[PDB]
């Protein structure tokens, strides 16, 4: 479709900020590609589960409840949204 190559929107300074919050002092020049890959895999899994959940209910809109249920099924509980 029209939406393509949006993985490049995760800029290098954003990854640097995440690393700084994680507590990293020096970063090599080949980390951004690996970070993009792992983020893509994680998002793919979560979104697939959420879309299955929204498909079972005969709806056309993905809600926060579906995301929460998918995350809980994956083993990562999330507090603050619905519940």
């Amino acid at each position: 479709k029209v939406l393509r190559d949006n993985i490049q929107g995760i800029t290098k300074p954003a990854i640097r900020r995440l690393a700084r919050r994680g507590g990293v002092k020096r970063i090599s020049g080949l980390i951004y590609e690996e970070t993009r890959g792992v983020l893509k895999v994680f998002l793919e899994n979560v979104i697939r589960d959420a879309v299955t959940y929204t498909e079972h209910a005969k709806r056309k809109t993905v809600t926060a409840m579906d995301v929460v249920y998918a995350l809980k099924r994956q083993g990562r509980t999330l507090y603050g949204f619905g519940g």
Binding site: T77, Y79, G80, G82, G83
Partner: protein, 97 residues
């Protein structure tokens, strides 16, 4: 038209907070987090009790199952105080029924 009502634990959480800290408030997001925490703990304990009742070939849930589930699910220091509080509440309820 009035929407369908929704149940939560806001009132009781606020009552407990006023009991502990008489001059502290709370924000909406914190209240939502507390609601989620209460629901999660309730579900865990209830599921453990149901499994325990099923293992021994029984068809009823009593306070013994709840006590054993609390003993299994919580660490020791929290478990002792929770057991004491539950036993005291049950004794007080039964005495003045």
């Amino acid at each position: 038209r009035r929407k369908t009502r929704k149940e939560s634990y806001a009132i009781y959480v606020y009552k407990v907070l006023k009991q502990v800290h008489p001059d502290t408030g709370i924000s909406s997001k914190a209240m939502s987090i507390m609601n989620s925490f209460v629901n999660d703990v309730f579900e865990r304990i209830a599921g453990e009790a149901s499994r325990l009742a099923h293992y021994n070939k029984r068809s009823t849930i009593t306070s013994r199952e709840i006590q054993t589930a609390v003993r299994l699910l919580l660490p020791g220091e929290l478990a002792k105080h929770a057991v004491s509080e539950g036993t005291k509440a049950v004794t007080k309820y039964t005495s003045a029924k």
